[PDB]
Amino acid sequence: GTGPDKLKKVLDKLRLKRKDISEAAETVNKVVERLLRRMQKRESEFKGVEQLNTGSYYEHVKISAPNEFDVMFKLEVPRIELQEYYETGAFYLVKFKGNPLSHFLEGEVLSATKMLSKFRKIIKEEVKEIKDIDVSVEKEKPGSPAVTLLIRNPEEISVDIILALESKGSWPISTKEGLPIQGWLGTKVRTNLRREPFYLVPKNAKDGNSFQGETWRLSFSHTEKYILNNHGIEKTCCESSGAKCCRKECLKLMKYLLEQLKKEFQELDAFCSYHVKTAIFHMWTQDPQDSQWDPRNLSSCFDKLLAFFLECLRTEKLDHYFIPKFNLFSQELIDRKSKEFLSKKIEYERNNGFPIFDK
Ligand SMILES: [Zn+2]
């Protein structure tokens, strides 16, 4: 019943939530594999699609909602020329240096709207041919670029399929000072990770417009997965012949704290798990030693993450780990009132034994 024991019990509660999630993931994977086989057999601009096995499930940090999954389909696109749409690196237009994607251009700019419309049309046709699993495509929602499958097993699982372009070019200059892992995972790892492809995911800016509709955000979901699964200064961190740390446990707890708060308070709508992930990436940089994340320090490590997060809220600053000029907590993206509200709620939990965990 002490504070430390209670936090360990929350981790036990999250451990129990995993079984339903793992079972659901196996059903999701069967459907997704079936669909990818169909899309790989059919002749189209999307024939080369593959699953990118990233996101919270494959990082082992999906803590809730066994009825909701996101999956990314990557498509290699040669000779992408990027234009920064926001010079922070928050958004890009895609242009090209014939061209396999020529049907989806609006002038020299790749239309996410056109490309996604065709993606959706094909998915819808091919899903109707999957006869031995109960699966349909959800009606398109304006402003939602994912193509959502509805699987009945017999319970309903929603799967959001996100198209990601893959570029094998050098990472965008907005990322030059990003991935600050040099004192933690080191310079050789950083070099190696930056030699890997990067991804572009459709996302509407919702700004002045014109090319509202045709903007893309950068995605490093592969790099993030690698970091989560290779997160120690020692190569053996959390392996069978190494020592456990509490890095992922702290991420899980903080994600759960935010999830529980968000369920109760619609004033926290603008926050999301990626804020917590980004914060913990910075914490792992700040405190690189595995000994700083000893399992015995679960409570103190959790508390330092909350303190760091509260300082990000106070300063309205949380830099994208890969794109340092992109401030996820800018005044423009999140109102001061929302940040002050979340600060208050976090301090309350922290000072009163985290009652919200129990809801
Ligand atoms: Zn570890």
Swiss-Prot record:
Region (Interaction with collided ribosomes): 182-223
Residues with a covalently attached lipid (S-palmitoyl cysteine): 245-246, 312
Recorded consequence of changing residue 176 to E: Slightly decreased interaction with nucleosomes
Impact noted for substituting residue 144 to A: Enhanced stimulation of interferon production
PTM note: The N-terminal disordered part (1-146) is phosphorylated by AURKB during the G2-M transition, blocking CGAS liquid phase separation and preventing activation. Phosphorylation at Tyr-58 by BLK promotes cytosolic retention. Localizes into the nucleus following dephosphorylation at Tyr-58. Phosphorylation at Ser-273 activates the nucleotidyltransferase activity. Dephosphorylation at Ser-273 by PPP6C impairs its ability to bind GTP, thereby inactivating it.
Annotated catalysed reactions: GTP + ATP = 2',3'-cGAMP + 2 diphosphate; GTP + ATP = pppGp(2'-5')A + diphosphate; pppGp(2'-5')A = 2',3'-cGAMP + diphosphate
Binding site for ATP: 56, 224, 255, 273-277
Region (DNA-binding): 15-58, 225-248
Mechanisms controlling activity: The enzyme activity is strongly increased by double-stranded DNA (dsDNA), but not by single-stranded DNA or RNA. DNA-binding induces the formation of liquid-like droplets in which CGAS is activated. Liquid-like droplets also create a selective environment that restricts entry of negative regulators, such as TREX1 or BANF1/BAF, allowing sensing of DNA. A number of mechanisms exist to restrict its activity toward self-DNA.
Residues carrying 5-glutamyl glutamate: 155
In-chain residues carrying the UniProt-annotated modification Phosphotyrosine: 58
Impact after mutating residue 168 to E: Slightly decreased interaction with nucleosomes
Top-rank EC class of the record's enzyme: transferase
Keyword Disulfide bond: no
Phenotype when changing residue 97 to E: Impaired tethering to chromatin, leading to constitutive activation in the absence of DNA
Effect of residue 239 to A: Abolished homodimerization and subsequent activation. Does not affect nuclear localization and tethering to chromatin
Motif range (Nuclear export signal): 11-16
N6-lactoyllysine sites (modified residues): 13
Outcome after substituting residue 272 to S: Gains susceptibility to mouse-specific RU.521
The organism's place on the tree of life at top rank: Eukaryota
Effect listed in the UniProt record for changing residue 125 to A: Increased DNA-binding activity
Cofactor binding note of this UniProt entry: Binds 1 Mg(2+) per subunit. Is also active with Mn(2+). Mn(2+)-activated enzyme forms an inverted pppGp(2'-5')A intermediate, suggesting a non-canonical but accelerated 2',3'-cGAMP cyclization without substrate flip-over. Mn(2+) ions are coordinated by triphosphate moiety of the inverted substrate, independent of the catalytic triad residues.
Outcome of substituting residue 188 to R: Abolished ubiquitination by TRIM56, leading to impaired homodimerization and activation. Does not affect sumoylation. Strongly reduced sumoylation
Name of the featured protein: Cyclic GMP-AMP synthase
Organism: Mus musculus
Gene: Cgas
